[PDB]
Amino acid sequence: KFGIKPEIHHIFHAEPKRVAKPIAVIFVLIIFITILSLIVTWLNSCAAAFNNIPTGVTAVYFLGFIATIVGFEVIFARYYLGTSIFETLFSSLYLGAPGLLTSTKFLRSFG
């Protein structure tokens, strides 16, 4: 090869192929209607409704308990959108400390 050598290129591998959008949209609609059906079964059909509701200070503890339960899932959803792990840990430690106390107070008071 004193004078010249042949050219060389790299042949890449084909990437794995996605699927068509309509099928995924149909299968998302099916799951959505299933969840709505479950909610409707809970509310009306199965006659499982809000018989007793806490009032006064027990209602404030109830609001705190719901706030904790929903706040943890908001934290997880925000962490699913590219939030740093350390920030999630700090936001969870700043919510568990009041939330644990309020939830234990509610669960002992209401029973």
């Binding site: 004193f2 004078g3 010249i4 050598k5 042949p6 050219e7 060389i8 290129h9 790299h10 890449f12 591998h13 996605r18 699927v19 068509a20 959008k21 995924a24 949209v25 299968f27 998302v28 799951i31 959505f32 299933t34 969840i35 479950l38 909610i39 809970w42 499982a48 409704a49 809000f50 018989n51 007793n52 509701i53 806490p54 109830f62 308990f65 719901i66 339960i69 929903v70 899932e73 509610f106 209401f110």
Partner: protein
């Protein structure tokens, strides 16, 4: 000199597999009194780990008073991580020999650079299930402490 396809150097953000880089080198000839551009069409660039992976032919894209600049077209880096040498050795008999290589590490793809779970279209039915289970669980927990 070699650098990213858009301008950023290697020291700002290192290379990763299936990137877009570009290489460029300048030659000059001495005719006895002063330097001049060196019009040669036989130059070849080799990107090689241990045996050549890319062997491209340079084309003249730059001109200076005493320097001729050759560059490769934008090319995709190989599909495997490693430690690759970028090399350009002009060696033809009857004329001076010139070599200039450099060793660069080409890393793999980090977890943060894969396509997200919603950009894909095959996995829109696996996120609806999770969101539905989470919503149903929240409503269940709410209705459990509010029922005889």
């Amino acid at each position: 000199v070699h650098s990213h396809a858009d301008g950023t150097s290697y020291d700002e953000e290192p290379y990763k597999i299936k990137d877009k880089v570009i290489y460029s080198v300048g030659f000059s000839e001495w005719n006895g009194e002063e330097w001049l551009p060196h019009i040669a069409d036989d130059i070849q660039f080799e990107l090689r780990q241990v045996d050549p992976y890319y062997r491209l032919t340079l084309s003249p894209s730059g001109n200076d008073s005493e320097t001729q600049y050759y560059t490769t077209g934008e090319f995709i880096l190989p599909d495997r991580h490693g430690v690759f040498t970028f090399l350009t050795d002009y060696r033809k008999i009857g004329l001076s020999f010139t070599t200039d290589k450099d060793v660069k590490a080409i890393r793999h793809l980090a977890n943060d650079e894969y396509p997200r779970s919603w950009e894909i279209s095959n996995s829109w039915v696996y996120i609806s299930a999770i969101c539905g289970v989470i919503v149903a669980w929240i409503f269940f927990v709410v209705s459990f402490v509010t029922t005889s």
